[PDB]
Amino acid sequence: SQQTRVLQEKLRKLKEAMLCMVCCEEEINSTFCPCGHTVCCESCAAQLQSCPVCRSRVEHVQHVYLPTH
Amino acid sequence: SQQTRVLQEKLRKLKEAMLCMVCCEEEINSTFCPCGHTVCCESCAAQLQSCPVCRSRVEHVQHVYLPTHT
Ligand SMILES: CS(=O)(=O)c1ccc(Br)cc1
Ligand SMILES: CS(=O)(=O)c1ccc(Br)cc1
Ligand SMILES: [Zn+2]
Ligand SMILES: [Zn+2]
Ligand SMILES: [Zn+2]
Ligand SMILES: [Zn+2]
């Protein structure tokens, strides 16, 4: 039905929100500290000196173990 | 259709995985450091001495801003 198409789109958007904002390919699993933005995979997060959301300096990256991982 | 019911179940399970493992009511938004388990809301994470998943000592809690927060 049309609701099948609507639910497929909601699922796709939720799954896309869980992917790295930079590479768009790998799951988010890293937090920029101290700001707390958690938007990248470990490979993209290792290469950024500044947070791509708020531009605060990245002091270090904390790996996050999330229930969806 | 039955396919709509299947998608509803997948969405519900994904949304439930985003909720605090202790209160089951609030969204996860806190990380136990240094272990990295990110399974609680700010209130439930605040008084835990050890990680509820791996038993590691909690040195501090890091707040996390996630793209899925609603
Ligand atoms: C494990 S969870 O459901 O808390 C979650 C939250 C945000 C992202 Br991005 C991925 C997983
Ligand atoms: C608190 S908010 O809605 O501005 C926000 C900011 C950054 C991310 Br990532 C998620 C949510
Ligand atoms: Zn990436
Ligand atoms: Zn930031
Ligand atoms: Zn809680
Ligand atoms: Zn832990």
From Swiss-Prot, chain A:
Induction: Expression is directly activated by NR1H2 and NR1H3. Expression is not dependent of the sterol-response element-binding proteins (SREBPs). Expression is indirectly induced by LDL. Ubiquitously expressed. Signal peptide: none annotated. Changing residue 20 to A: Abolishes ubiquitin ligase activity. Autoubiquitinated. Transmembrane segments: none annotated. It is found in: Cytoplasm; Cell membrane. A zinc finger (RING-type) spans 20-55. Residues 64-66 are annotated as: Critical for homodimerization. The RING domain mediates ubiquitination and the neurite outgrowth inhibitory activity. E3 ubiquitin-protein ligase that mediates ubiquitination and subsequent proteasomal degradation of myosin regulatory light chain (MRLC), LDLR, VLDLR and LRP8. Activity depends on E2 enzymes of the UBE2D family. Proteasomal degradation of MRLC leads to inhibit neurite outgrowth in presence of NGF by counteracting the stabilization of MRLC by saposin-like protein (CNPY2/MSAP) and reducing CNPY2-stimulated neurite outgrowth. Acts as a sterol-dependent inhibitor of cellular cholesterol uptake by mediating ubiquitination and subsequent degradation of LDLR. Homodimer. Interacts with the E2 ubiquitin-conjugating enzyme, UBE2D1 (via RING-type zinc finger). Interacts with myosin regulatory light chain (MRLC) and TMEM4. This is E3 ubiquitin-protein ligase MYLIP. The gene is MYLIP. The chain holds residues 369 to 436 of 445 of the full protein.
